[PDB]
Design an enzyme around this catalytic site. Structure first.
Site, PDB file in Angstrom:
ATOM      1  N   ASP A   1      50.500  54.314  10.879  1.00  0.00           N
ATOM      2  CA  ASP A   1      49.809  53.756  12.022  1.00  0.00           C
ATOM      3  C   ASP A   1      48.751  52.802  11.563  1.00  0.00           C
ATOM      4  O   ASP A   1      48.051  53.040  10.581  1.00  0.00           O
ATOM      5  CB  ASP A   1      49.154  54.840  12.868  1.00  0.00           C
ATOM      6  CG  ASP A   1      48.621  54.296  14.176  1.00  0.00           C
ATOM      7  OD1 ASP A   1      49.464  53.939  15.018  1.00  0.00           O
ATOM      8  OD2 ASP A   1      47.387  54.214  14.365  1.00  0.00           O
TER       9      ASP A   1
ATOM     10  N   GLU B   1      45.358  50.560  12.840  1.00  0.00           N
ATOM     11  CA  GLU B   1      44.389  50.048  13.789  1.00  0.00           C
ATOM     12  C   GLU B   1      44.193  48.584  13.428  1.00  0.00           C
ATOM     13  O   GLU B   1      44.298  48.211  12.257  1.00  0.00           O
ATOM     14  CB  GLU B   1      43.072  50.805  13.686  1.00  0.00           C
ATOM     15  CG  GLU B   1      43.219  52.300  13.847  1.00  0.00           C
ATOM     16  CD  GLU B   1      43.402  52.731  15.289  1.00  0.00           C
ATOM     17  OE1 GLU B   1      42.852  53.799  15.610  1.00  0.00           O
ATOM     18  OE2 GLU B   1      44.074  52.023  16.095  1.00  0.00           O
ATOM     19  N   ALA B   2      43.943  47.736  14.419  1.00  0.00           N
ATOM     20  CA  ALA B   2      43.764  46.315  14.131  1.00  0.00           C
ATOM     21  C   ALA B   2      42.815  45.667  15.113  1.00  0.00           C
ATOM     22  O   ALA B   2      42.266  46.333  15.991  1.00  0.00           O
ATOM     23  CB  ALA B   2      45.105  45.590  14.125  1.00  0.00           C
TER      24      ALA B   2
ATOM     25  N   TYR C   1      54.977  46.435  17.164  1.00  0.00           N
ATOM     26  CA  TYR C   1      53.651  46.289  16.577  1.00  0.00           C
ATOM     27  C   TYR C   1      53.281  46.480  15.102  1.00  0.00           C
ATOM     28  O   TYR C   1      52.719  45.567  14.492  1.00  0.00           O
ATOM     29  CB  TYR C   1      52.780  47.249  17.382  1.00  0.00           C
ATOM     30  CG  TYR C   1      51.328  46.912  17.224  1.00  0.00           C
ATOM     31  CD1 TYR C   1      50.779  45.838  17.895  1.00  0.00           C
ATOM     32  CD2 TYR C   1      50.516  47.635  16.368  1.00  0.00           C
ATOM     33  CE1 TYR C   1      49.461  45.504  17.738  1.00  0.00           C
ATOM     34  CE2 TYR C   1      49.185  47.313  16.210  1.00  0.00           C
ATOM     35  CZ  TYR C   1      48.666  46.243  16.891  1.00  0.00           C
ATOM     36  OH  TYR C   1      47.349  45.904  16.737  1.00  0.00           O
TER      37      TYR C   1
ATOM     38  N   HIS D   1      41.684  57.780  18.404  1.00  0.00           N
ATOM     39  CA  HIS D   1      40.784  56.676  18.077  1.00  0.00           C
ATOM     40  C   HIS D   1      40.815  56.272  16.596  1.00  0.00           C
ATOM     41  O   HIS D   1      40.139  55.328  16.184  1.00  0.00           O
ATOM     42  CB  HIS D   1      39.358  57.042  18.505  1.00  0.00           C
ATOM     43  CG  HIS D   1      39.234  57.347  19.967  1.00  0.00           C
ATOM     44  ND1 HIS D   1      39.668  58.538  20.508  1.00  0.00           N
ATOM     45  CD2 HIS D   1      38.747  56.619  21.000  1.00  0.00           C
ATOM     46  CE1 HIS D   1      39.446  58.536  21.810  1.00  0.00           C
ATOM     47  NE2 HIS D   1      38.887  57.383  22.134  1.00  0.00           N
TER      48      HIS D   1
HETATM   49 MG   LIG Z   1      49.761  52.809  17.041  1.00  0.00          MG
END
Ligand SMILES: [Mg+2]
Ligand SMILES: [Mg+2]
Lengths: 217, 218
Positions: free
Chosen positions: A12, A14-15, A120, A178
DNA sequence: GACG
DNA sequence: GACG
């Protein structure tokens, strides 16, 4: 197809924002699980699966090139300022050495698993790697989208976002929505719902990451 | 004294058994943190939040000898089940990995481990001595969290990891079976009074290449 | 002691 | 959709 995937790597990112914004990665997390550990469910609702005892885990915060969108900062608790203040490095040559070495301790073939990865995480990661004089360390590794996988499993009008699925299966809200690691752990739990069926699905649909094309650039 | 340590890398190892037994690492967790990432309201004092920006590494490692029954009881790991899932051994790549993990850190870097001066640090040194590669910790520093937590508490009984935690926080540690669990427990403890903590640890940091191998150099 |  |  490409043979049995020996290692699943839940991934995973985050960006800084959504795809339309040409985002940069602010945090990455990999959780490598052996198939064996995985095929190692209850009633209704089943308890949230415990993760396997044997797992390798990597979590890195990363200084992006451009600032986070405001939306991304609020969801992730990450900003360009703090990642730099706190001395985080870019997505550079090393990081790929790091990933390389980490990938190196997994038995091949490895298959990356990400939720909406085909849209994504995968094309994002590709883009970010392309930026490097270093060679990509994922050319030999495969990938698959957990949304497709769980649509098929659950088939045995619904939303297929990470939380919709998780709550539906376990009637519990996910623990941490988060952080990259939080999202990987939630991902891991939905994939443990039907371990047997899922690895079968992953084996049929595994696809070379070399092909995955860049989000952008 | 050596200057400022930029990265506090909390460290914990699981292994085949205790020092007398010539033990081999079976799991390793590093959680790297920046001095920046360092109030509380209520009783008993809340278990704090890990800070937002952290690097975490956790690896299972296959040992060349069997886990003593006590090490298997504690950790749920066994040589045969590490080996099923084709976990590698403590080898050169691993050092490269650690090398690379540490190279993403602001320098200088100081390992913190509970009883490290007596268990983790000397054991790590032994594991690293065995192989073709240079140690990635040759330029790294170390401090023991026991000694550190002694001082800080003595300025306000058991100093086992759990005893300190349950005592500050009045909860059992979340997980005492895995290297990451112990790192997280150790992390929360070091956040009880981070200011002093870190005061205390920049005064004390020491080389890791001065650390004598627990044993071996086979 | 305290570490597995 | 669904990803930040
Ligand atoms: Mg994700
Ligand atoms: Mg320990």
């Amino acid at each position: 197809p490409h043979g049995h995937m020996q290692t699943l790597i839940f991934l995973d990112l985050e960006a800084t924002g959504l795809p339309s914004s040409r985002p940069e990665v602010t945090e990455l997390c990999l959780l490598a699980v052996h198939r064996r550990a995985l095929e190692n469910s209850q009633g209704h609702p089943p308890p949230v699966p415990r993760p396997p005892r044997v797992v390798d885990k990597l979590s890195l915060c990363i200084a992006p090139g451009k600032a986070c969108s405001p939306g991304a900062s609020e969801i992730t608790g990450l900003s360009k300022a703090e990642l730099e203040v706190q001395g985080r490095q870019r997505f550079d040559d090393n990081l790929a050495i790091l990933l390389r070495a980490f990938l190196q301790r997994q038995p091949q073939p490895c298959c990356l698993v990400a939720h909406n990865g085909d849209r994504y995480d995968f094309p994002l990661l590709q883009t970010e790697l392309a930026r490097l004089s270093t060679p990509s360390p994922l050319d030999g590794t495969f990938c698959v989208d957990s949304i497709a996988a769980l649509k098929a499993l659950e088939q045995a009008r619904k939303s297929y976002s990470l939380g919709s699925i998780y709550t539906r299966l376990y009637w519990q809200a996910p623990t941490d929505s988060h952080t990259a690691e939080g999202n990987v752990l939630t991902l891991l739990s939905i994939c443990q719902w039907k371990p047997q069926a899922l690895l079968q699905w992953v084996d049929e649909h595994a696809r070379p990451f070399s092909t995955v094309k860049p989000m952008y650039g």
